[PDB]
Design an enzyme around this catalytic site. Structure first.
Site, PDB file in Angstrom:
ATOM      1  N   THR A 193       0.837  -1.194   0.000  1.00  0.00           N
ATOM      2  CA  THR A 193       0.000   0.000   0.000  1.00  0.00           C
ATOM      3  C   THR A 193       0.871   1.242   0.000  1.00  0.00           C
ATOM      4  O   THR A 193       2.064   1.183   0.296  1.00  0.00           O
ATOM      5  CB  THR A 193      -0.899   0.024   1.246  1.00  0.00           C
ATOM      6  OG1 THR A 193      -2.222  -0.376   0.882  1.00  0.00           O
ATOM      7  CG2 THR A 193      -0.925   1.405   1.882  1.00  0.00           C
ATOM      8  N   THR A 194       0.275   2.374  -0.338  1.00  0.00           N
ATOM      9  CA  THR A 194       1.040   3.604  -0.352  1.00  0.00           C
ATOM     10  C   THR A 194       0.837   4.360   0.969  1.00  0.00           C
ATOM     11  O   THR A 194      -0.223   4.277   1.605  1.00  0.00           O
ATOM     12  CB  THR A 194       0.662   4.476  -1.591  1.00  0.00           C
ATOM     13  OG1 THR A 194       1.466   5.658  -1.603  1.00  0.00           O
ATOM     14  CG2 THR A 194      -0.796   4.856  -1.570  1.00  0.00           C
TER      15      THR A 194
END
Lengths: 233, 241, 242, 250, 244, 243, 198, 244, 111
Positions: E31-32
């Site tokens: 995920t960012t």
């Protein structure tokens, strides 16, 4: 390829995967389906017990860790015993030392960290078992899904094991319905039996085949088997 | 520090290191044991790849664990020492704590255990040795003869042999020993052993040593002559036909 | 090489699996439970006529109410039997009562996965799994007569009847038909003696086959040859009877 | 973590060779030459200071080291390995001898000590042998002067003179020709400088050469007076200036 | 030859550590998450993918606090992430206990730095499958930090990692340019929500859940806290608006 | 057999590849640095390259203060650079405590070198991909430069350079000294020695610098300190009004 | 204490040891044999603390027999005693020392001479013509110092003991219930079962 | 992990052989020959110095004959370094036996201990065996003159005459051809040198390439004596036995 | 010197009926001549129809009850919620106490 990067958990594949961990995750899929779902007053577990012959017994899938916490397993039985037993100690320690019930959310954080340790050190092996922990604590009812990778997640409901996807879709659909089944354990349970029959195929859930467990507001985690579940089949 | 699992399972469910341990036993000199009606005898062959030894000092093939029990073997010698020691030490410990010498069966069960342990402990290889343990339980007259192997298994025999060509001599024995009427004499008992060894020794008066054990710690090892004589009387049995 | 506690891509533990193989090669062992007791039977299998068949011990006593039969690499069984006996006796010392047959079994099973070369979870020192399976039979006041199958996997089941060893798959199939909730002890004896005769390469006699049982009244006992022989004779006659 | 290398890294090949020890010796071959000569009243050891950059100051690095005040050492092979070997050899001299008998160890034994250290790096778990060969020279009351060579195998032997490293074969031959059992120390020093010149490509002077001796007692090097029985160290490294002077009489 | 990528402490012939490099893969795949250093604190935000409607919303919290003034967010193998924070916590505790003062952000950085670098030293361990953005306020201001599986880390004005790491780094850089005088804690919370919403395009397949947390001298008294309720929705809006 | 290239054991050539590959990693940063000795100071110049705009320039550095008197510049990846720094700092504090005086630059080097040597001989310890340059104005030795490498080697220098274009910088300096005939920059103030260093760093690399393209460290009697963007700027302006 | 006497005559070593076992106020046993045979020609008598006494003797025995089997040889009395001294000497500086005193009498089959060794819990070893542990020494050393001859026959030795035992019964506070006598010689160890009136 | 570089020096071959023990022996087959001959009135130890030079200081040297006790000595064949490590523990063992029993350690007993130590490196540890074989020459009052031999395997045996190292087979044949039970020390001394002389891989058998030792009971005394010939003593006996 | 023990007074009584039993205790906790509390329960229900009380030194008394109770909890886990017979509890408690035989629980207990 994969053959050169799956000899142990202390090795990353050129793509960032940990196969030994993935192989463990597989043992879960090879495992008998089990379902977990909760409302705001109760949490429930329904599991399909698998037997060897017709001369053998059906192996237990549900384990109690405290009066307010318990779980269902899918995969390597031994590892569930090890992990549940360890989860019993933690609940125990929380009482004896703080006179405080171990919150489900924390029990999870604990399991995750325990698992993670067997995936970064030489000689160790991941746990080949998946767990669904339900429990009632100071913030209500809870459902957790434990993966050998260490990933523990809180959900309204879910399933794991062979054909689990069936039940999971069914719950994902029934969501808005069972989540509101408060003040009625029998209803939350039937919704649980339905979700699980969604992953049937081989046969149909019988009395010495079905296993149910429930925890809640004024309900201490209690397991039901045989004749006890008859009223749900 | 070193704990590599050296004895592990293979696809077909075998533990090759233990199996190979046995191969080390097959290559060892032959050893045989036959129990009479009032005694047990153990015979062992003496290799001949080199001859110019000093038989006086050179370690013999039959060992005394205690006064009433002996143990002979086939396999790696260096390994046999370690086993013979542990057995002897346990022999004393059992007297010291149970105030009674070890039974032949017990001393055997102990040795077997040591071996078994070495087949499932890290960093160690099994014992390339197989043993023959015989004697008389304390205050008992019924002879005892047991055999153990690297796997850690053991059992009693009316007679048995281990080592090279043990296949041959076992046959000899299987068709020359009657449980109905066991060698009722120390003499006829030692004869049967010498006979059984000859099948594989190929004339070796100085290559065959015999040790006789009787009840109440009466253990003795015959000399070349006593043995040479047995060989003599036997060779005639063949010619006189 | 490859870790002794490595996973196969199918989600299994190699060593454990291979362990199960060595067991298939083991001597036949059969157990049948009845509301009158549990019967344990085994194949002696003497590798020579000179071997004194009675020095073959594949059915041992754990406690007066718990006995067991073994199959596979039997040398591995010693440390397990010792553990089992100790656990049963200790429980009696700590709780002034007999140990439940299931717990006894559960206790043994706990040694099973205690192996590796540095497994992060405690101090599992034992280079490889056990190469033997066990049929634990017994009785207690909580679940009456019980028969258990304990494998090196670390898991165990409870069978009404179960047969492990070389002749199993076939023998088990037999048991699937033969067994029924009303068998008598006597019936189970011949039945075991029968299925043994079928799967044994050898001609079953009171010297390469051994029976035993566990009853609430007299506890675990091993049938002495004479007793077994007669049972065999009895079996033959009822068989030749039709 | 935890050194899981609890097994030998040097093992026997089917031919009966010990790979790592062999390779270690190869490493020694590649190293700069160094030699030793035993005279009737002293010993001399020398090597070449192969400055690995004109910016680097070769003085701030000694290939010739004092082990005890009457024992010196010099090598051929991997400089860093030698370095730690020196420290170990200096300590072992105290811990296993001076602290017990109140006197410095005699050459053969100290050597024997160092040898054992190397020997162990040849069998211990998780390690490689030392990539150096040593030439130790010293003197003790009951053994006089002596010269020893220690190999990565852990073997050592006494020499009247010898050389190791690069042009050892060449130098060894040149020494057999010039050595006799009547050489005075100054003689050996001369022969040393000659034997060295052959293995030297470029500059050959007191700044590129490093040589020390084990001769008479230097009370002037003691640091204190007042104790009859303390006469000074027999070990003495020559100065750059001392070397050049001799090079003119070359 | 080859095989210089099967053991963790091995140097390839060109001087690399493939195992570490393979770890980075596990990270980029995650995920960012970002970090924005405002003028008196730091803001942390993360992308929480909604794998299904089954995930109880607002429940599986990702951002973690160390002590009371430090915040941690990471992308990659979450379990490894937690493992690292646990160590940071002990690390911070050990520090305070002896020096009394709560651990300085820089010192804490190197504390996690040395630990992580430690896992690139032996073949008996696996490197960390996470990059971590962390920081807080201390005796001399705010500090934002990012730590790589290699053990490398530096102080950043803005930082991002994960799937949408580029979109982010793109946006963060824009901010840095259009705000030479600094961004306010309040503003950084908004800007963060936007930057997360944009970076979510490289994963526009699954729906997500935003999670912001900040540590501002003027807003939270130098204590790390989660942005909730009104201020949160307000930012979700400021983002949802600029995404169209 | 072919694993004599994965761990620190000998190759038939009698080589230690892993040590060589370690050296290879030292250039991973693509930064050059040099050290020169003043009349009574020691200066170390190192390139500074901060490409990312999101990075806080101030937190980036390969120069470390090991103690009040010893400074250390590292050529190599930063995580190994910091593991090395920390260890040296500890080794420095402990030395003082145990012996009652400040550890001498050269001794610190020797200790770090011996430490490297070990990773060279022990299989489970990998070498550190870094070359350490230690500088100080030793109370006994005067201005000092001691550099250590992954091989466990070290020595003192009149001056030295490290990094990709090491050779250009070295030969440049070598020439300057063959000319001056002395082993040091005959300058009283360190600012001039700093300018000298920066100058030749330019001549040898054929590149111009801005205050943010460098990192400077100075070691004087009883103190080693690093310059600031401005301290450097003022220094850059100086070399400018001479060219 | 208990009575531990030893006298070495011409061709044998005679050991006498009180048969009384008293615990506080009551005499629990009157037939105690305070001796252990270390090997066919080596006998050791002992006296001291309640538990330590036998524990030490049996321990020594076990070790001596083990050496016998391992080497198929019988260690000389001298050697056996040196082993024993070492053990006690270790014990004295241990956490909890063995408080036992012993007399070692054996016939050296090689030298063909009897030997008597006296060793105390401190590991003090001395070889003597005659010796005793405890108080007995005070009444018997003067007797033997008087009527002792190196060439005495085994019978003379017994009579000499008879003389010592009488003095001990006459002048000693405690009722040691008589002594058990044993002889060690070329033919081994044997017990004079008729000394209660010899 | 580390298992990747583990030679497993202590395992069985499919034939039930011990690789390293075998290979170790292979190594010893290239070591200077050592011969031990036992006569009625004494024992003889003769060995060939492997690799020699004009410069080799021979008076101060010892690479094959080592004194362990006053009545025991050994001749080595294999890694000298390895031999020493074992020799020192042997020397100690002797002393302990003395300290415990106040009697000189029986020859066989010392030999069994040393062999047991070797045997160990053969069954556990993961380390390489010692590349050494010993010819033990000693005397005690229980078995008088004795001659033993031990090797990397850990096994040991007694002999009337025996050899170790290179060309053993050649030497054994020659010894087996001229040995007689009623030999006398002098006789054995000659037979020893003659054998080496015929097996030497070198040109001529000169004193500078030998090490000699005799265990005799100098009648004019009654005690046994160990004599480890000096260079000149060998040079003499060499001329005498007719090898000049 | 530091004295690890103390006395909180109190008195308990247990009587067995034909089909019942009773365990009683005062509810006063004291230290010397002062009263710490007029109500501090000392007899507890440990489940499985077992009432226990460890009188004497309060700390040691509570530790024991806590321990025994906890022992019951696990008994259930380990043996499938099977009720712990009074005789078993007795044996068990003996082990609880004798375990500290060399630094005892300064309490005289009754169940």
């Amino acid at each position: 390829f994969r053959n050169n990067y799956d000899g142990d958990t202390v090795t990353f594949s050129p793509t960032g995967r940990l196969f030994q961990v993935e192989y463990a995750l597989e043992a879960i899929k090879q495992g008998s389906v089990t379902v977990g779902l909760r409302s705001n007053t109760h949490a429930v577990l329904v599991a399909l017990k698998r037997n060897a012959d017709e001369l053998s017994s059906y192996q237990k899938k549900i384990i109690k860790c405290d009066e307010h916490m318990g779980l269902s397993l899918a995969g390597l039985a031994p590892d569930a015993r090890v992990l549940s037993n360890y989860l019993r100690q933690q609940c125990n320690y929380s009482s004896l030392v703080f006179n405080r019930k171990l919150a489900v959310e924390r029990a999870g954080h604990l399991l995750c960290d325990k698992a993670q340790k067997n995936t970064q050190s030489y000689g160790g092996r991941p746990y080949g078992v998946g767990l669904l922990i339900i429990g009632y604590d100071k913030s209500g009812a809870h459902l957790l899904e434990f993966q050998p990778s260490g990933n523990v997640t809180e959900l309204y409901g879910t399933a794991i094991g062979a054909r689990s996807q069936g039940a999971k879709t069914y719950l994902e659909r029934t969501l808005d319905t069972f989540i509101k089944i408060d003040g009625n354990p029998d209803e939350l349970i039937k919704a649980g039996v339905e979700a699980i029959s969604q992953s049937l195929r081989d046969e149909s859930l019988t009395v010495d085949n079905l296993s149910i467990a429930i925890v809640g507001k004024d309900t201490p985690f209690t397991i039901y088997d045989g004749e006890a579940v008859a009223k749900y089949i | 520090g070193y704990d590599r699992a050296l004895s592990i399972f293979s696809p077909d469910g075998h533990i090759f290191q233990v199996e190979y341990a046995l191969e080390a036993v097959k290559r060892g000199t032959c050893a045989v044991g036959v129990k009479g009606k009032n005694c047990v005898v153990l015979g062992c062959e003496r290799r001949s790849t080199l001859k110019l030894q000093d038989t006086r000092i050179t370690p013999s093939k039959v060992s005394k664990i205690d006064s009433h029990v002996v143990l002979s073997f086939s396999g790696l010698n260096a390994d046999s020492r370690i086993l013979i020691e542990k057995a002897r030490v346990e022999a004393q410990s059992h007297r010291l704590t149970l105030e009674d010498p070890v039974t032949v069966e017990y001393l055997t069960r102990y040795v077997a255990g040591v071996q078994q342990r070495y087949t499932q402990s890290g960093g160690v290889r099994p014992f390339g040795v197989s043993t023959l343990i015989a004697g008389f339980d304390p205050r008992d007259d019924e002879p005892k003869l047991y055999q153990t192997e690297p796997s850690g298994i053991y059992s009693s025999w009316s007679a048995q042999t281990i080592g090279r060509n043990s296949k041959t001599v076992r046959e000899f024995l299987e068709k020359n020993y009657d449980r109905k009427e066991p060698p009722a004499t120390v003499e006829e008992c030692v004869k049967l052993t010498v006979r059984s060894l000859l099948e594989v020794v190929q004339t070796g008066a100085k290559n065959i040593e015999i040790t006789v054990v009787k009840p109440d710690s009466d253990i003795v090892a015959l000399s070349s002559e006593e043995i040479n004589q047995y060989v003599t009387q036997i060779e005639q049995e063949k010619q006189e036909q | 090489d490859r870790g002794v506690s490595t996973f196969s891509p199918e989600g299994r533990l190699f060593q454990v699996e291979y362990s199960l193989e060595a067991i298939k090669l083991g001597s036949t062992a059969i157990g049948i439970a009845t509301k009158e007791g549990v019967v344990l039977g085994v194949e002696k299998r003497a590798t020579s006529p000179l071997l004194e068949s009675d020095s073959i011990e594949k059915i041992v006593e754990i406690d007066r109410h718990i006995g067991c039969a073994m199959s596979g690499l039997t040398a591995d069984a010693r440390s397990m039997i010792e553990h089992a006996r100790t656990a049963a006796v200790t429980h009696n010392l700590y709780y002034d009562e007999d140990i439940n047959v299931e717990s006894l079994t559960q206790s043994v099973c706990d040694l099973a996965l205690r192996f590796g070369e540095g497994a992060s979870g405690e101090e599992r020192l034992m280079s490889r799994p056990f190469g033997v399976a066990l049929l634990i039979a017994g009785h207690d006041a909580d679940d009456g007569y019980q028969l258990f199958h304990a494998e090196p996997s670390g898991t165990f089941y409870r069978y009404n009847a179960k047969a492990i060893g070389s002749g199993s798959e076939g023998a088990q199939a037999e048991l699937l038909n033969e067994w029924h909730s009303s068998l008598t002890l006597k019936e189970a004896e011949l039945l075991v003696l029968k299925i043994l005769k079928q799967v044994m390469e050898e001609k079953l006699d009171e010297n390469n086959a051994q029976l035993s049982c566990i009853t609430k009244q007299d506890g675990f006992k091993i049938y002495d040859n004479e007793k077994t022989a007669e049972l065999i004779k009895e079996l033959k006659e009822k068989e030749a009877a039709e | 973590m935890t050194d899981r290398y609890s097994f030998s890294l040097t093992t026997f090949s089917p031919s009966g060779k010990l790979g790592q020890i062999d390779y270690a010796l190869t490493a020694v071959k590649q190293g700069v030459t160094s030699l030793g000569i035993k005279a009737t009243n002293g010993v001399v050891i020398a090597t070449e200071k192969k400055s690995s950059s004109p910016l680097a100051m070769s003085e701030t690095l000694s290939k010739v080291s004092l082990l005890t005040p009457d024992i010196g050492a010099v090598y051929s092979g991997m400089g860093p390995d030698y370095r730690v070997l020196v420290d170990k050899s200096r300590k072992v001299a105290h811990t296993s001898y001076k602290r017990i008998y109140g006197e410095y160890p005699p050459t053969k034994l100290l050597v024997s000590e160092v040898a054992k250290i190397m020997q162990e790096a040849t069998q211990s778990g998780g390690v490689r042998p030392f990539g150096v060969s040593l030439l130790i020279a010293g003197h003790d009351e009951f053994n006089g002067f002596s010269l020893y060579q220690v190999d990565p195998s852990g073997s050592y032997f006494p020499w009247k003179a010898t050389a190791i490293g690069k042009g050892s074969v060449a130098a060894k031959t040149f020494l057999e020709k010039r050595w006799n059992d009547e050489l005075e120390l100054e003689d050996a020093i001369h022969i040393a400088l000659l034997t060295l010149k052959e293995s030297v490509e470029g500059e050959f002077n007191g700044d590129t050469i490093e040589l020390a001796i084990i001769g008479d007692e230097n009370p002037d090097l003691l640091g204190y007076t007042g104790i009859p029985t303390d006469k000074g160290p027999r070990f003495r490294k020559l100065t750059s200036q001392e070397i050049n002077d001799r090079l003119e009489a070359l | 030859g080859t095989g210089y990528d099967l053991s963790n402490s091995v140097f390839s012939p060109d001087g690399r550590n493939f195992q570490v490099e393979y770890a980075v893969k596990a990270v980029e795949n995650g995920t960012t998450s970002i970090g924005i250093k405002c003028n008196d604190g730091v803001v942390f935000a993360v992308e929480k993918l909604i794998t299904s409607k089954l995930l109880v919303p607002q429940k599986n919290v990702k951002i973690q606090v160390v002590d009371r003034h430090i915040g941690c967010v990471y992308s990659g193998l979450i379990p490894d992430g937690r493992h690292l924070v646990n160590r940071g916590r002990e690390e911070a505790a050990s520090f305070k206990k002896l020096y009394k003062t709560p651990i300085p952000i820089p010192a804490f950085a190197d504390r996690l730095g040395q630990y992580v670098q430690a896992h690139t030293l032996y073949n008996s361990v696996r490197p960390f499958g996470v990059s971590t953005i962390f920081g807080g306020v201390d005796k001399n201001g705010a500090h934002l930090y990012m730590l790589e599986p290699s053990g490398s880390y530096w102080g950043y004005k803005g930082a991002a990692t994960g799937k949408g790491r580029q979109s982010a780094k793109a946006e963060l850089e824009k901010l840095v340019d259009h705000h030479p005088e600094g961004l306010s804690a309040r503003e950084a919370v908004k800007q963060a929500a936007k930057i997360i919403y944009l970076a979510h395009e490289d994963n526009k397949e699954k729906d997500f859940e935003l999670e912001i947390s900040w540590c501002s001298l003027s807003e939270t008294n130098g204590l790390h806290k989660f942005v909730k309720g009104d201020l949160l929705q307000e930012a979700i809006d400021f983002a949802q608006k600029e995404i169209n | 057999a072919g694993y004599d290239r994965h761990i620190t054991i000998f190759s038939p050539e009698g080589r230690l590849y892993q040590v060589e590959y370690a050296f290879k990693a030292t250039n991973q940063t693509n930064i050059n640095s040099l050290a020169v000795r003043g009349k009574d100071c020691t200066v170390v110049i190192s390139q500074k390259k901060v490409p990312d705009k999101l990075l806080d320039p101030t937190t980036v550095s390969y120069i470390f203060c090991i103690s009040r008197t010893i400074g250390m510049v590292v050529n190599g990846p930063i995580p190994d650079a910091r593991n090395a720094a920390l260890r040296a700092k500890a080794e420095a504090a402990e030395f003082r405590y145990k012996y009652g005086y400040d550890m001498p630059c050269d001794v610190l080097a020797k200790r770090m070198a011996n430490l490297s040597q070990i990773y060279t001989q022990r299989a489970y310890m990998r070498p550190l991909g870094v070359i350490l340059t230690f500088v100080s104005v030793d109370e006994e030795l005067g201005p000092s430069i001691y550099k250590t490498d992954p091989a466990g080697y070290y020595v003192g220098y009149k001056a030295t350079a490290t990094g990709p274009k090491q050779q250009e910088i070295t030969t440049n300096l070598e020439n300057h000294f063959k000319k001056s005939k002395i082993d040091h920059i005959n300058e009283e103030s360190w600012e001039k020695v700093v300018e000298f260093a920066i100058t030749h760093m330019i001549d040898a690399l054929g590149t111009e610098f801005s205050k943010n393209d460098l990192e400077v460290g100075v070691a004087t009697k009883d103190k080693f300190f690093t310059l600031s963007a401005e301290n450097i700027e003022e220094r850059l302006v100086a070399i400018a009004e001479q060219d | 204490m208990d009575i531990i006497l030893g006298i070495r005559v011409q061709d044998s070593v005679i050991l006498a040891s009180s048969k009384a076992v008293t615990r506080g106020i009551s005499v629990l046993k009157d037939s105690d044999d305070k001796t252990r045979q270390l090997s066919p020609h080596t006998l050791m008598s002992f006296a001291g603390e309640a538990g330590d006494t036998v524990q030490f003797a049996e321990y020594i025995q076990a070790n001596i027999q083990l050496y016998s089997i391992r080497e198929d040889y019988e260690l000389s009395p001298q050697a056996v005693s040196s082993f024993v001294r070492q053990e006690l000497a270790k014990s004295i500086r241990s956490r909890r020392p063995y408080q036992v005193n012993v007399l070692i009498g054996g016939y050296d089959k090689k030298k063909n001479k009897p030997e008597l060794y006296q060793i105390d819990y401190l590991g003090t070893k001395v070889e003597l013509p005659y010796g005793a542990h405890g108080y007995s020494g005070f009444y018997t050393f003067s007797l033997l110092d008087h009527h002792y001859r190196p060439d005495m026959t085994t019978e003379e030795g017994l009579d000499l003991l008879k003389l010592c035992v009488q003095e001990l019964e006459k002048r000693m506070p405690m009722d040691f219930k008589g002594v058990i006598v044993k002889i060690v010689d070329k033919d081994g160890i044997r017990q004079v079962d008729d000394f209660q009136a010899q | 992990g580390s298992r990747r570089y583990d030679s497993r020096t202590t395992i069985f071959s499919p034939e039930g052989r011990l690789y390293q023990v075998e290979y170790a022996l292979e190594s010893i087959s290239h070591a200077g020959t050592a011969i031990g001959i036992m006569a009625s009135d004494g024992i003889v130890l003769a060995a060939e110095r492997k690799v020699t030079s004009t410069l080799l200081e021979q008076d101060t040297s010892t690479e094959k004959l080592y004194k362990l006790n006053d009545k025991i000595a050994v001749a080595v064949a294999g890694l000298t370094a390895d031999a020493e490590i074992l020799i020192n523990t042997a020397r100690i063992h002797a002393q302990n036996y003395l300290k415990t029993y106040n009697e000189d350690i029986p020859v066989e007993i010392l030999v069994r201990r040393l062999s047991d130590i070797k045997q160990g490196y053969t069954q556990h540890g993961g380390l390489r065996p010692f590349g050494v074989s010993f010819i033990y020459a000693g005397y005690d009052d229980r078995y008088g003159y004795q001659l033993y031999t031990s090797n990397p395997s850990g096994n040991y045996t007694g002999w009337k005459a025996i050899s170790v190292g290179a060309n053993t087979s050649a030497a054994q044949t020659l010894l087996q051809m001229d040995y007689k039970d009623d030999m006398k020390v002098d006789d054995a001394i000659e037979l020893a040198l003659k054998t080496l002389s015929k097996t030497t891989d070198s040109s001529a058998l000169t004193y500078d390439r030998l090490e000699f030792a005799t265990i005799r009971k100098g009648a004019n005394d009654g005690e046994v004596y160990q004599k480890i010939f000096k260079p000149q003593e060998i040079k003499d006996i060499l001329v005498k036995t007719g090898i000049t | 010197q530091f004295n690890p023990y103390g006395d909180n007074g109190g008195t308990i009584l247990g009587i067995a009926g034909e089909d019942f039993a009773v365990l009683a205790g005062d509810t006063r906790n004291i230290t010397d001549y002062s009263i710490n509390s007029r109500y501090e329960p000392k007899v507890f229900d440990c489940g499985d129809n077992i009432v226990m009380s460890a009188n004497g030194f309060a700390a040691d008394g509570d530790a024991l009850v806590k321990r025994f109770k906890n022992s019951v909890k696990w008994y259930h886990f380990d043996h499938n919620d099977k009720k712990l017979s009074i005789n078993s509890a007795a044996r068990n408690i003996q082990h609880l106490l004798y375990g500290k035989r060399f630094f005892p629980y300064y309490v005289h207990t009754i169940i």
